Amino acid sequence: DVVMTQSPLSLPVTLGQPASISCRSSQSIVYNNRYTYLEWFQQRPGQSPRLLIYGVSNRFSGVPDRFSGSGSGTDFTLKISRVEAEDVGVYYCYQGTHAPYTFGQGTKLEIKRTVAAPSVFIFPPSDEQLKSGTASVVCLLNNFYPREAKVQWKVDNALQSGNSQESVTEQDSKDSTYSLSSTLTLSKADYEKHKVYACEVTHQGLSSPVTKSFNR
Amino acid sequence: QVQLQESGPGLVKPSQTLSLTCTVSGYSITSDYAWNWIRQHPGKGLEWIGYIRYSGHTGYNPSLKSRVTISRDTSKNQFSLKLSSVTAADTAVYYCARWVDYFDYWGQGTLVTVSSASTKGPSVFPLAPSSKSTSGGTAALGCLVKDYFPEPVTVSWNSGALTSGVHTFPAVLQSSGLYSLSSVVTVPSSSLGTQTYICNVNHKPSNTKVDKKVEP
């Protein structure tokens, strides 16, 4: 089949700067020298893909004019003149010329921005969840950059491991920050056994690690 | 003014036949164009499945041809995909789309999980604003949505009224094979008691709809 290859796979871009994505097909995808069926789509998290460019160079109506596409033959390219926050997502090329029609593997556009420290919150388990036998304790890290954070749980000053899992949002389409939750899950049984429940966040935006905690 | 919408089962058991239907609004399947099915392996790229023309003719991706048929019901302006003898490799988000020389209009997509397990509605626990979130300017609160299968779950706040500051995290798998997620929101500390906050959770495969109100 025809193999569309994109490059780079992930593309860091300072907001307001340009960006370019290369898509290269393994064979020619020109139809008859008359026309070339190549599209560029943008896919935002949890959304269907959105058409950006058709026939290599034509911008689809509605698309901001800071998007452009070009190329010819086996080498094509998508360009954003000035990147804006909502541009964050994944971008695919597509060849409609030779069946089976195929997509690229996608290029993830990551927005670079200034370091931003997280606002940290800790949540003790609901009375309701407790009666039903389990205990989930939630540590929230809100609106921070970069993605890399280190959340360590300490129960009565004892470091946990293997009983918590993190989840992270995608870059916010407005401020380009992340949010993270770490949930510590314990049996109601193992929960009463201790009193101090601590969440200790280590991040670039913090000079010293921040700890939010409670007792019971 | 064109709208496409996919409908189908969110859950299908291995070796059964997967059946999806697309309902087109604002344009007639019979007029012109080719009507397509595309899927997206979770966390991965896109695969073209096949199309049905305005004429009823069809063409398929050879990788799936021996297991699929596409067909239409002109009197309902619907066209459908059927994927036979499914496995776990067929777990994907499935997209409906129109091809006018390019994919212009897409449907929203439905996730299809291929599993032997049974549907399981979620437990909903409040995330309680404790006194340190309170003493500062702003305070955090949310809903824990635990132990459900399959994906997806739908969370909103105050029936759509609250949107700003809302982070709904990606569902994480538990060692129990069941999904769990949190949805949280940032609100001005002063409005507690004054303003009531309810999270509206909807899990369709179990026909579950909870509306938990969060207070401290």
Give the containing element (helix H, strand E) for A193: none
Largest CA distance in chain A: 75
| A110 contact B CB<8A | no
Alpha carbon of B176: minimum distance to chain A alpha carbons (Å): 12
Of B62, B102, B140, the CB nearest to A54: B102
Instruction: Mark yes or no for CB contact B59/A99 under 8 Å.
Output: yes
CATH 2.60.40.10 positions along chain B are 1-116, 117-215
Which of B41, B93, B125 best probes binding to A when mutated, by most A CB atoms within 10 angstroms? B125
Resolution of this entry in Å? Answer: 2.8
* A48/B108 touch (CB, cutoff 8 Å), yes or no: yes
> How big is the CA angle at A147 (ends A141 and A150), to the nearest 5 degrees?
60
**Is A106's CB within 8 Å of B127's CB?**
no
Nearest chain B residue (CA) to A56: B102
Distance from CA of B106 to the nearest CA of A (A): 7
CA pair distance A183, A138, nearest whole angstrom: 5
Q: Would you say A15 and A83 are in contact if contact means Cβ atoms under 8 Å apart?
A: yes
A-chain CB neighbours of B169 within 8 Å are 167-169, 179, 181
Q: Is A99 exposed, middle or buried (0-12, 13-18, 19+ CB in 10 A)?
A: middle
- Torsion, Cα of A56, A112, A84, B172 (10° steps): 80
* A96 interface with B at CB cutoff 8 Å: yes
Chain A residues with CB inside 8 Å of B167's CB? 142, 169, 179
Q: Quickly name the fold that domain B1-116 has.
A: Immunoglobulin-like (2.60.40)
Which amino acid is residue A107, in one-letter code? T
The answer, for B77 touching chain A at a CB cutoff of 8 Å, is: no
B169 touches A at CB < 8 Å? yes
CB contact under 8 A, B109 and A102: no
B102:A121 CB<8 A: no
Three-state secondary structure call for residue B65:
helix
β-strand pairing of B68-73 with B110-114: unpaired
Rounded distance, CA B36 to CA B102, Å? 11
Strands (E), chain A: 4-7, 10-14, 19-25, 38-43, 50-54, 58-59, 67-72, 75-80, 89-95, 102-103, 107-112, 119-123, 134-144, 150-155, 158-159, 164-168, 178-187, 197-202, 210-214
Q: Is B94 on the interface with A (CB under 8 A)?
A: no
**Domain definitions of chain A by residue range:** 1-112, 113-216
- DSSP per residue, A118-139: PEEEEEPPPHHHHHTTEEEEEE
Quick count: other Cβ atoms within 10 Å of Cβ B28? 11
Give the C-alpha separation, A52 to A93, whole Å: 10
Can you tell me whether residue A203 is helix, strand or coil? Answer: coil
Q: Report the top-level CATH class of A113-216.
A: mainly beta
User: Is CATH 2.60.40.10 the classification given to domain A1-112?
Assistant: yes
Q: Does the beta carbon of A51 lie under 8 angstroms from any beta carbon of chain B?
A: yes
* A1-30 residues touching B, CB cutoff 8 A: none
DSSP assignment of B177-202, as one string?
S-EEEEEEEEEEGGGBTTB-EEEEEE
Return the structure tokens found at B78. Answer: 């619907």
**Residues in chain B closer than 8 A to A125 (CB atoms):** 125
The CATH code belonging to domain B117-215 is: 2.60.40.10
Contact B25, B107 (CB under 8 A): no
Q: Which amino acid belongs to residue A178?
A: Y
**From B62, B104, B133, residue closest to A100, measured CB to CB:** B62
